[model samples]
Target: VLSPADKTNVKAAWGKVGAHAGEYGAEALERMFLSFPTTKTYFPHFDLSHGSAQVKGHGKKVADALTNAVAHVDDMPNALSALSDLHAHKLRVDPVNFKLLSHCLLVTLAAHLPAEFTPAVHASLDKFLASVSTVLTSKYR
Candidate 1:
């Protein structure tokens, strides 16, 4: 569902974000955990502190997944299938948490990549996150 220009913008924008992926990723997770405290239960080991190694590593993990998703948009279902199963069956996480995290992630992108994160970028990103959330929550049913 993404256009060629969308891919281009996503790739280029991610390049800049990836440079500081650890920091931004951690911040996104921190924002989510802080803003939506209930989500913390899913990550028993994360400590959920604002700048802990667990939070930062989880953040990088998320950003890396997004970067990977940009390259394999059509295969997102398969890409995130393992994770979906883990979250749905194993962790029994509420899918709604993904939505909350996406908002925090978008805010993180806007805060850090202000120049590269334009309106078009947000649109593309929202589209990507929507698809990811769909795939991630699919196994819930």
Candidate 2:
């Protein structure tokens, strides 16, 4: 239902967000995921037991994929739909897992990027995550 202009804005915002992945943002994510061991358990297939180098390498891949997908938000329906179908029919990852992941990400951001984590950043990230969760939940439902 997003208009073309809305999609553009979303892409632009996500593009700026994606560009920050190599900096504090990425570190924040890594620290958060590390802190929440239970959250990582959800994706047991991804081996996080490796040292920092391996974790960073894998994390960057995830971050890049997410960023690139968001950057092409308008064109992402196929992929998102596939994910929704997988969650709904195939993998059946619990719907609530999305919320758990979002919480971990936010907590990580707050803990790791204390200096840069402003109320606005929190709000923006929450909004971004809400949209993501909504889509996934809709699919699951």
lDDT of 1 by residue, 1-141 (tens): 777777777777878875787678788888888888888888887676546677767778777877778677667777777877887777766777878988998898899877988888889888778878888778776
Candidate 1: C-alpha lDDT: 0.79
The prediction achieving the highest lDDT against the true structure is 1
lDDT of 2 by residue, 1-141 (tens): 555555554454455444555443445445656765655655566555534565666557556655755765656556566655656777666666667667766775566556555675666666666666666557655
Worst 10 residues of 1 by lDDT: 45-54
Per-model TM-score, in order, reads 0.86, 0.59
The per-residue C-alpha lDDT of model 1 at residue 41 equals: 82
- RMSD of each predicted structure: 1.9, 4.4
Each prediction's Cα lDDT score?
Answer: 0.79, 0.59
Give me candidate 2's TM-score against the actual structure. 0.59
